[PDB]
Coordinates of N, CA, C and O in Angstrom, one line a residue:
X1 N 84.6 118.8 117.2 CA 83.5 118.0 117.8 C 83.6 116.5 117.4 O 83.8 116.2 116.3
X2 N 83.5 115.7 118.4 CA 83.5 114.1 118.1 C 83.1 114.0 116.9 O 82.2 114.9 116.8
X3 N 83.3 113.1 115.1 CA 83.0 112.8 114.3 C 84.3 111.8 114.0 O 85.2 111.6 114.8
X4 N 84.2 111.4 113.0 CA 84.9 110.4 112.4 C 86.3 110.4 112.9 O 86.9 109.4 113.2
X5 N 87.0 111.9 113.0 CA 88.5 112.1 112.7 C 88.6 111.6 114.4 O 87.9 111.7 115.4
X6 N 90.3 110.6 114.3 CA 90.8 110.3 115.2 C 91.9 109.3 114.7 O 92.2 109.1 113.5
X7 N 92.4 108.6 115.8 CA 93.5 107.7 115.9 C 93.0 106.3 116.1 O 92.9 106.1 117.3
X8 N 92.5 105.1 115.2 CA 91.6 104.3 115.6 C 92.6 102.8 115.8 O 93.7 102.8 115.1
X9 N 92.4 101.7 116.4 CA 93.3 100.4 116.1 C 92.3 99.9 116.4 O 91.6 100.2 117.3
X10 N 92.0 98.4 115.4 CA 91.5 97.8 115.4 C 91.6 96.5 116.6 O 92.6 96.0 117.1
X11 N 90.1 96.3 116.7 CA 89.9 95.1 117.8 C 90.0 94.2 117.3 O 90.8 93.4 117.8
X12 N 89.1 93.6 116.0 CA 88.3 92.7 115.7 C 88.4 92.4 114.0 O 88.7 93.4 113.3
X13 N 88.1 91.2 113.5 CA 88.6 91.2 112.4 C 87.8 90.2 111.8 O 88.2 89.1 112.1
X14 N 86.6 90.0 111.1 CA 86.3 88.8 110.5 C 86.0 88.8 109.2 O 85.7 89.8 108.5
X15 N 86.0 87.3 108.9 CA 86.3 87.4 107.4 C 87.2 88.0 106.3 O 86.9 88.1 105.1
X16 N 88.2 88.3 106.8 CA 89.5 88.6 106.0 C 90.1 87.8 104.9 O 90.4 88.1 103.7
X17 N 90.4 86.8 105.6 CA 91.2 85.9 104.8 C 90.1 85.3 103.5 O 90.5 85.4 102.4
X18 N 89.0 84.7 103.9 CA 87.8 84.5 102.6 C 87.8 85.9 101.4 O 87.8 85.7 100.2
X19 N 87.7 87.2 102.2 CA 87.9 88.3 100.9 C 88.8 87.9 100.3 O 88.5 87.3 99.3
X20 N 90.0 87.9 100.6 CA 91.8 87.6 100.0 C 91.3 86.7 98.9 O 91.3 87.0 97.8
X21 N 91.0 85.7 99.2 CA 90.8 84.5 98.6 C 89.7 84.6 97.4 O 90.0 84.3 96.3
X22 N 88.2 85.4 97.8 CA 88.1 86.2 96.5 C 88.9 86.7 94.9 O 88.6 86.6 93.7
X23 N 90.0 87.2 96.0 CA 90.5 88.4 95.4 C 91.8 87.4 94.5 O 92.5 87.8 93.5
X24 N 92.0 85.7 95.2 CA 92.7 84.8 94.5 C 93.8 85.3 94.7 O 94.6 85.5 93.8
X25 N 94.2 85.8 96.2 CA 95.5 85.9 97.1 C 95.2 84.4 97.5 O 94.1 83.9 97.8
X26 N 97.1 83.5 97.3 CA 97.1 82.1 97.3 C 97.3 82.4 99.6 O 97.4 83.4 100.4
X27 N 97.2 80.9 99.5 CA 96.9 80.6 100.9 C 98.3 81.0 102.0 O 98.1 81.2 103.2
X28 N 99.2 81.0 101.7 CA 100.5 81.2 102.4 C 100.3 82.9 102.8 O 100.3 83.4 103.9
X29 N 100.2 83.5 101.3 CA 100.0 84.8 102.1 C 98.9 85.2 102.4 O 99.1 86.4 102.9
X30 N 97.7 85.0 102.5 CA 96.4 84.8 103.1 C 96.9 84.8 104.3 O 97.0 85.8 105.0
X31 N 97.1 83.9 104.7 CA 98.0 83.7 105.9 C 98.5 84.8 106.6 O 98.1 85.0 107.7
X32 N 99.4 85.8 106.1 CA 100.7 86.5 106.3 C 99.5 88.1 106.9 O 99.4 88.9 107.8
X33 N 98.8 87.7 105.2 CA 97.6 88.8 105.7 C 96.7 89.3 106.9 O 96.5 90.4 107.5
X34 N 96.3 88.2 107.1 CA 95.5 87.4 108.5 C 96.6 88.5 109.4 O 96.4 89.6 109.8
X35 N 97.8 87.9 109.6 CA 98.6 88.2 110.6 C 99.3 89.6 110.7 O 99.9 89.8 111.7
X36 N 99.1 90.7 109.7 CA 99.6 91.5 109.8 C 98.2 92.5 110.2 O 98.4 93.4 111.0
X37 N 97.2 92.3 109.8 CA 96.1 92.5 109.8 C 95.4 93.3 111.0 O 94.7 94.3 111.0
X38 N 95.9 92.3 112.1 CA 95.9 92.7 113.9 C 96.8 94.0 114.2 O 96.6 94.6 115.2
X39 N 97.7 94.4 113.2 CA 98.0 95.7 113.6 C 97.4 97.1 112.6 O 98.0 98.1 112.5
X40 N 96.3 96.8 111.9 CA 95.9 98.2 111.4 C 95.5 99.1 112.0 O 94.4 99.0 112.5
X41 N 96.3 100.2 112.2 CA 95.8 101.1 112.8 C 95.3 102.2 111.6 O 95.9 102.4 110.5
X42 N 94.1 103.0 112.0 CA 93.6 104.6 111.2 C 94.0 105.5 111.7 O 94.2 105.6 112.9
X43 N 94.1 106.2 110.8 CA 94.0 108.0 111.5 C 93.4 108.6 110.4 O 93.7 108.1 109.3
X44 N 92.5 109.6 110.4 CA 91.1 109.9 110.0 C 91.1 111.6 110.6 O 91.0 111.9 111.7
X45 N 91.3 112.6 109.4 CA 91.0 113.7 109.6 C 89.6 114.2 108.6 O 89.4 113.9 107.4
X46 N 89.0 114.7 109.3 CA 87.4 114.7 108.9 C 87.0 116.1 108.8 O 86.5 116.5 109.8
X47 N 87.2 117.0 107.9 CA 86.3 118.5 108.0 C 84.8 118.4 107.4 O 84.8 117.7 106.4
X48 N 83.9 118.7 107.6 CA 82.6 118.7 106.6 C 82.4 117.5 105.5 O 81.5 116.7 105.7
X49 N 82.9 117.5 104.6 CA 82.4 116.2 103.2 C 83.8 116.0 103.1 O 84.0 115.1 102.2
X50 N 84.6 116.2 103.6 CA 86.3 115.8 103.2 C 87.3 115.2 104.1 O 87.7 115.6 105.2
X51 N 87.5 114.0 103.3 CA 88.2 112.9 104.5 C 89.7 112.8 104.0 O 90.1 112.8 102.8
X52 N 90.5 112.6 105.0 CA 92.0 112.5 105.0 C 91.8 111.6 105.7 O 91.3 111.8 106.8
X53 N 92.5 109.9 105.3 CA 92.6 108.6 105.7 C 94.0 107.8 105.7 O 94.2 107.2 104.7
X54 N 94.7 107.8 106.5 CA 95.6 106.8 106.7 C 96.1 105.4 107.2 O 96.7 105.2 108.2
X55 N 95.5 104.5 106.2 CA 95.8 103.0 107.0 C 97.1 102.6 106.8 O 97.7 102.4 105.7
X56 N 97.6 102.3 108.4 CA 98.9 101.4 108.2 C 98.7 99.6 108.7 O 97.6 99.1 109.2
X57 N 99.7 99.1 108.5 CA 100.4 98.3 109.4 C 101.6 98.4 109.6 O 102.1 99.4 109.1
X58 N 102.3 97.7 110.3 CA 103.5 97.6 110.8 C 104.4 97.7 109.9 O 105.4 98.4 110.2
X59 N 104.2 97.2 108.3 CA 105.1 97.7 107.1 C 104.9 98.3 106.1 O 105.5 98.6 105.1
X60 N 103.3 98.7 106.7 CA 102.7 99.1 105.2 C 101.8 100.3 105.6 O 100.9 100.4 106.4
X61 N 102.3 101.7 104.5 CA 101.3 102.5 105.0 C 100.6 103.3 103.8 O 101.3 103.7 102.9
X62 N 99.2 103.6 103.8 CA 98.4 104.2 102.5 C 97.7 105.5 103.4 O 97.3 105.5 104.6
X63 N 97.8 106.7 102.3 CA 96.8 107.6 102.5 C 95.5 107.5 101.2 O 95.7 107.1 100.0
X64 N 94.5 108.1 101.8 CA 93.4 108.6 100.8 C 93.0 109.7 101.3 O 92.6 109.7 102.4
X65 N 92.9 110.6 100.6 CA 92.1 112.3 100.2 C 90.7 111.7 99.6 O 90.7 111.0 98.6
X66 N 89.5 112.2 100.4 CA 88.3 112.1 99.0 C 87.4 113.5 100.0 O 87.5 113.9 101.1
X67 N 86.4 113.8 98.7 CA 85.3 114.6 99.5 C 84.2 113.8 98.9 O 84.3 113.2 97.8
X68 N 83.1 113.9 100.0 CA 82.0 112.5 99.5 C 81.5 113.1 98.4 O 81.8 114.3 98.2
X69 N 80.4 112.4 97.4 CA 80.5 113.0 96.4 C 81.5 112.7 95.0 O 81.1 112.1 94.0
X70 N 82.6 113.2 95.2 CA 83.3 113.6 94.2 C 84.4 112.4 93.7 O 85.5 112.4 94.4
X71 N 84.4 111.9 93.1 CA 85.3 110.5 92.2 C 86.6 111.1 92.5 O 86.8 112.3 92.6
X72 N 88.0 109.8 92.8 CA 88.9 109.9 93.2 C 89.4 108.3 92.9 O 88.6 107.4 93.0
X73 N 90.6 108.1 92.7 CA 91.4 107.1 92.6 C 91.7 106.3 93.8 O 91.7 107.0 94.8
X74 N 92.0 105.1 94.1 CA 92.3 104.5 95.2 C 92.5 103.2 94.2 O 92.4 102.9 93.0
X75 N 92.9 102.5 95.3 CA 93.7 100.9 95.3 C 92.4 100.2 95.7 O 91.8 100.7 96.6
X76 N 92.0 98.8 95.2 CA 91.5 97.7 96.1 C 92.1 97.0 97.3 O 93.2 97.4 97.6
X77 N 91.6 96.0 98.2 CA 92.1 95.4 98.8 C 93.3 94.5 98.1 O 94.2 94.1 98.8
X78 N 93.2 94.2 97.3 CA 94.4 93.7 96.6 C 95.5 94.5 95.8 O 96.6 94.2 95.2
X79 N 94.6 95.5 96.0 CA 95.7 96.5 95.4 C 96.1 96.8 93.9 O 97.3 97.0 93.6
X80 N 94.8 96.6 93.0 CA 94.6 97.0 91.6 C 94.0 98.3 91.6 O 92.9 98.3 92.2
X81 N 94.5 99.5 90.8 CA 93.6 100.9 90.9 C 92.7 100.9 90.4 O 92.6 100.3 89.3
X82 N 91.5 101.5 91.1 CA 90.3 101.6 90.9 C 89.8 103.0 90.8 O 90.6 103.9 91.1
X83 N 88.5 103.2 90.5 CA 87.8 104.7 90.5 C 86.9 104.8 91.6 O 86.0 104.0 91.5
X84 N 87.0 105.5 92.5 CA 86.3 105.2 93.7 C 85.2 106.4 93.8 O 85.6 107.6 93.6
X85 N 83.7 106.1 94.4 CA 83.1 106.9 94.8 C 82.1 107.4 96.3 O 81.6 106.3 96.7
X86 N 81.9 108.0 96.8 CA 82.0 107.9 98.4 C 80.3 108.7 98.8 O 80.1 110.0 98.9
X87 N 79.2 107.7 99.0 CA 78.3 108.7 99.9 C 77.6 108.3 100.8 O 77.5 107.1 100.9
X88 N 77.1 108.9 101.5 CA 76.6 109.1 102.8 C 75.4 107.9 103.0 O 74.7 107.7 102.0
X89 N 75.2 107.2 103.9 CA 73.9 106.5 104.0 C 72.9 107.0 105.4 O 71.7 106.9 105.7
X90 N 74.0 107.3 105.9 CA 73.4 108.2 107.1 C 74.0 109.1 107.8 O 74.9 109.7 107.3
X91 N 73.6 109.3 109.3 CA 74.7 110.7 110.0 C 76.0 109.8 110.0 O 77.0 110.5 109.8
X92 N 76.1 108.7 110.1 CA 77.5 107.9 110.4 C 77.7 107.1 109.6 O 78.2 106.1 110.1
X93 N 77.4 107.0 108.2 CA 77.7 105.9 107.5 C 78.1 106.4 106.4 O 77.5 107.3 105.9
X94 N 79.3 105.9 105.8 CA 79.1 106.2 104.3 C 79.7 105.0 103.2 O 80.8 104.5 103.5
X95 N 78.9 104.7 102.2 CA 79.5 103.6 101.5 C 80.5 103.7 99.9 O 79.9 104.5 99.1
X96 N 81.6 103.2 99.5 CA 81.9 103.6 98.6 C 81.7 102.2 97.4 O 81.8 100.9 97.5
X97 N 81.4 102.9 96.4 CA 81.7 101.9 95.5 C 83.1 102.3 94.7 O 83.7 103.3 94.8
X98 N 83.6 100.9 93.8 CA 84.8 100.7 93.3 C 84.7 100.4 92.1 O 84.6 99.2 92.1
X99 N 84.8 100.8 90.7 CA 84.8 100.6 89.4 C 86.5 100.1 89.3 O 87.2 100.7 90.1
X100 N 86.9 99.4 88.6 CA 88.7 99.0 88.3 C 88.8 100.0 86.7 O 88.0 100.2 85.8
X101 N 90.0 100.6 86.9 CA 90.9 100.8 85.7 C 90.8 101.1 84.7 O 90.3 101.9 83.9
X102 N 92.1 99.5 84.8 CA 92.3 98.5 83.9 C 91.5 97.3 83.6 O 90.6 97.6 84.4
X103 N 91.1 96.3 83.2 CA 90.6 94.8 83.8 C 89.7 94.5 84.0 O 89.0 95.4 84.2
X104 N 89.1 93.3 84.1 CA 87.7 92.4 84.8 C 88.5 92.2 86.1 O 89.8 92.4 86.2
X105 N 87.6 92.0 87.2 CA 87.2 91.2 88.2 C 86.5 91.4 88.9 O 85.5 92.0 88.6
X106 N 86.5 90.9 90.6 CA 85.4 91.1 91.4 C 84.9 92.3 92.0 O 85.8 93.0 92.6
X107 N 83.3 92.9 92.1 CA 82.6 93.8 92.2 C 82.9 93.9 93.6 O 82.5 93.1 94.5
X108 N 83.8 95.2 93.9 CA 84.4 95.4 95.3 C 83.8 96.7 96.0 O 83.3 97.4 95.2
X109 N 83.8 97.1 97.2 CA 82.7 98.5 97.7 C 83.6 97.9 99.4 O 84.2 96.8 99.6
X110 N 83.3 99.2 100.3 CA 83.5 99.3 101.6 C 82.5 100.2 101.8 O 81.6 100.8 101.2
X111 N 82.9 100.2 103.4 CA 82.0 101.1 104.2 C 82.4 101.5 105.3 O 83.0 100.6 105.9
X112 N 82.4 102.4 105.9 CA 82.6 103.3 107.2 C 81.8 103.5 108.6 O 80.8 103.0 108.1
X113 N 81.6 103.7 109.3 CA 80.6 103.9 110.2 C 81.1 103.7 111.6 O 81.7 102.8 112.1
X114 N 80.8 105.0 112.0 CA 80.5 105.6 113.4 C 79.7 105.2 114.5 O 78.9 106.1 114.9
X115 N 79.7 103.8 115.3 CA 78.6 103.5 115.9 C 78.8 104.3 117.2 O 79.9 104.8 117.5
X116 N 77.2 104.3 118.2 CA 76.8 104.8 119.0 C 77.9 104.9 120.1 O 78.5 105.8 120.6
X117 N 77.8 103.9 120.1 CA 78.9 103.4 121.7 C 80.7 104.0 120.9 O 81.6 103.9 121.8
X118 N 81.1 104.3 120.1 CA 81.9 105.1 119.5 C 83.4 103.5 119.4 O 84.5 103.3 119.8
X119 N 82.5 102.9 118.7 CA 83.5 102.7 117.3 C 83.4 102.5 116.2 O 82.2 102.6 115.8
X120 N 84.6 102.3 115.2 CA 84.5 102.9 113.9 C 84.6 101.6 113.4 O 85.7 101.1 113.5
X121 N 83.2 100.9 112.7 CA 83.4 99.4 112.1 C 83.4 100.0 110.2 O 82.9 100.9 109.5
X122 N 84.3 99.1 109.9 CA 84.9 99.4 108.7 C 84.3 97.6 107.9 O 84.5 96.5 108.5
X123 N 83.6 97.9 106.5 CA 83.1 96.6 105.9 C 83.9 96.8 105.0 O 84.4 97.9 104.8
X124 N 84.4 95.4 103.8 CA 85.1 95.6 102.1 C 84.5 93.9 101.8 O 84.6 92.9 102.4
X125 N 83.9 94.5 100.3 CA 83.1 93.5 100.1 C 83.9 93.3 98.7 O 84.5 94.0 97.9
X126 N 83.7 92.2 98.9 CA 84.1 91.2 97.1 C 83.0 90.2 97.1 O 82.7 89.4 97.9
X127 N 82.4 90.6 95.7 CA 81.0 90.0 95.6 C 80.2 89.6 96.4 O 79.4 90.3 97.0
X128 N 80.2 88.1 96.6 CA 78.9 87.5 97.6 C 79.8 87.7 99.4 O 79.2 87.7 100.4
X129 N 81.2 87.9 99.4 CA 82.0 88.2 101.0 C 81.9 89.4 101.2 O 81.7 90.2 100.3
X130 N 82.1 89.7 102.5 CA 81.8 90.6 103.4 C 82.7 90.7 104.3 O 82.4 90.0 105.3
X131 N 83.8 91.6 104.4 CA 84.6 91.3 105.7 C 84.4 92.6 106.8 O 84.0 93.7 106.5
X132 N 84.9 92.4 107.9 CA 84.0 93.2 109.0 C 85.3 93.7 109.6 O 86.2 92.9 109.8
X133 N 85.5 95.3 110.1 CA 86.5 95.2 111.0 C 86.2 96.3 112.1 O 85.7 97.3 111.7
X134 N 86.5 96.2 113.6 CA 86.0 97.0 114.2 C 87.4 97.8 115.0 O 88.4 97.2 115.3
X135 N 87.2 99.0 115.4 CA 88.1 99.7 115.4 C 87.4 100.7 116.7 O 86.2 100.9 116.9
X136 N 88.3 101.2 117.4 CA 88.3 101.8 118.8 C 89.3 102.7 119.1 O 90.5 102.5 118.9
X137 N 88.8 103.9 119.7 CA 89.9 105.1 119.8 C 91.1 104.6 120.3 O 91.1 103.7 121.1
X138 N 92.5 105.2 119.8 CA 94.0 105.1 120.4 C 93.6 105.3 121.9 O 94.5 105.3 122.8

């Protein structure tokens, strides 16, 4: 039945490059980011509380295993390991928070969601930024 799981590529993209910069990714590849950026595609296998997640791009590709609930390992957007935890805010939402490691830095979290009209807007926050991305069936 229609839920999260599918083949998604994104439309839309804002605020990217300001997270990076957060995150004290210098401006050249901020840049590079921006641009590889337009090709993320998901794929999203979804049973009950348990998600199978694949984000690529064109050269880069990550999976995540989580069941909501239950703490699990992941990468930030910059790509320092973190402890990650995943729940529900509604029928279509769920938000995770991100504890690091190793290390100090910025207070990082995402979000998921299923809107009505059926796309999948995806949020990743570094402190006071917010970046937005929207995503539409293959």
């Amino acid at each position: 039945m229609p839920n999260f799981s599918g083949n998604w590529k994104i439309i839309r993209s804002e605020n990217f490059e300001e997270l990076l910069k957060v995150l004290g990714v210098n401006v050249m590849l901020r840049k590079i980011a921006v641009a590889a950026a337009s090709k993320y595609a998901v794929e999203i296998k979804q049973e009950g509380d348990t998600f199978y997640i694949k984000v690529s791009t064109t050269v880069y590709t990550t999976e995540i295993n989580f069941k909501v609930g239950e703490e699990f390992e992941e990468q930030t957007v910059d790509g320092r390991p973190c402890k990650s935890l995943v729940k529900w805010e509604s029928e279509n939402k769920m938000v995770c928070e991100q504890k690091l490691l190793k290390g100090e830095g910025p207070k990082t979290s995402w979000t998921k969601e299923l809107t009505n009209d059926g796309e999948l807007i995806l949020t990743m926050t570094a402190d006071d930024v917010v970046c937005t991305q929207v995503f539409v069936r293959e």
